[PDB]
């Protein structure tokens, strides 16, 4: 077991894939740095999910895994898993395949405004969410939203300003408060697979 | 074992996921029909790949699987797999996860022209490819290219017309001949994971 702080990486693209990991607590994003400098979120790893999947098939990781919150991960030796462990891995990888394909569709469904609303609602069901008197909120940056909505930070910031002005969200202390869930749901249209 | 003809579906979104499948021959695409009528290719299933993955985790398929060529598939009972089978499934799902994330990145890397060149080169390494005197070719429609390049058919057709005029490709009998591989590689920039 090993703990990681927000923004620390669990593994990097191109490095030896000797270890398979299972996320115990927190939220991890698998990302790719594009030719033009853009960082793109490929998928979200949630508690219970196996990642560093390359350890099961290749020699090196193909992507980089970054903790989005304080995260607790368990390293595992692929070659030392029993029948029961393999069953859990197969079932969980199947669930992540369902989720990443849904995420893929989301990136191509609706204008930016709808994609942002959908992503915020998705995050509301992850370890990135919390609640207080002001309401439900998610701790995420404008850049991270851009990374998961096929857009750039400047465009995300503009839509967030619109949503603030309209009363759907509020921002404070690196958080995005979801003030009108019903309105956000309508903006997103279809929800994004949270489990 | 069961054989499917091009365009026939192996399973449909929302139907009971009682069966896990392994593609023996041919090429299958997993797709989603979007709200606005758009069909989107979520991933490519190649010989050896397990699909209908929902049978390992849920009660119903979440997407639709369509044969892109004559395809031979083997149905499997998830609950009847031994240690060796589970190992193969885990390893293969890990490989498909690597490939679908690379596909995801491709959809957001470069202008349409580069995305089309990249997709054509990817297909050149699948069962959709063949060769004759005119050269290497891939049997694919303009619509299928649009479905896998985050674009619409009209836009794909225009770029293909440009590529024909420039000599990079030629078209005939529902095929796209790749005449200048070097030029296409340069257009694509980065290659798309073929295995």
From Swiss-Prot, chains A, B:
Signal peptide: none annotated. InterPro entries: cNMP-bd_dom, cNMP-bd_dom_sf, Env_Response_Regulators, HTH_CRP, RmlC-like_jellyroll, WH-like_DNA-bd_sf, WH_DNA-bd_sf. One of its GO terms (molecular function) is DNA binding. It comes from Thermus thermophilus (strain ATCC 27634 / DSM 579 / HB8). The keyword DNA-binding applies. GO terms for cellular component: cytosol. Residues 142-161 bind DNA. The keyword Lipoprotein does not apply. Activates transcription. Positively regulates PcrtB promoter upstream of the crtB operon in a cAMP-independent manner. Regulated genes include genes encoding DNA photolyase, phytoene synthase and cytochrome P450 monooxygenase, which are involved in carotenoid biosynthesis. Positively regulates the light-inducible gene cluster in the megaplasmid in a cAMP-independent manner. Keywords: DNA-binding, Plasmid, Transcription, Transcription regulation. Homodimer. PROSITE patterns: CNMP_BINDING_3, HTH_CRP_2. The lineage of its organism: Bacteria, Thermotogati, Deinococcota, Deinococci, Thermales. Coiled coil: none annotated. Residues 110-182 form the HTH crp-type domain. Gene3D superfamilies: Jelly Rolls (2.60.120.10), Winged helix-like DNA-binding domain superfamily/Winged helix DNA-binding domain (1.10.10.10). This is Transcriptional regulator LdrP. SMART domains: cNMP, HTH_CRP.
């Amino acid at each position: 077991m090993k703990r990681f702080a927000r923004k620390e990486t669990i593994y990097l693209r191109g490095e030896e894939a000797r270890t398979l990991y299972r996320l115990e607590e927190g939220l991890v994003r698998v990302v790719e740095l594009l030719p033009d400098g853009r960082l793109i979120t490929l998928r979200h790893v949630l508690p219970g999910d196996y990642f560093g999947e390359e350890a099961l098939e290749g020699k090196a990781y193909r992507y980089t895994a970054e903790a989005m919150t304080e995260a607790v991960v368990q390293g595992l030796e692929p070659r030392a898993m029993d029948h029961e462990a393999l069953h859990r891995v197969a079932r969980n990888l199947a669930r992540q395949m369902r989720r990443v394909q849904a995420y893929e569709a989301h990136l191509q469904t609706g204008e930016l405004r709808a994609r942002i609303a959908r992503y915020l609602l998705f995050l509301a069901d992850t370890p990135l969410s919390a609640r207080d008197r002001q309401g439900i909120y998610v701790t995420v940056s404008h850049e991270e939203i851009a990374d998961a909505t096929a857009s750039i930070r400047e465009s995300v910031s503009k839509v967030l300003a619109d949503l603030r002005r309209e009363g759907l969200i509020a921002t404070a202390y690196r958080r995005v408060y979801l003030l009108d869930l019903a309105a956000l749901e309508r903006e997103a249209g279809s929800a994004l697979e949270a489990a």
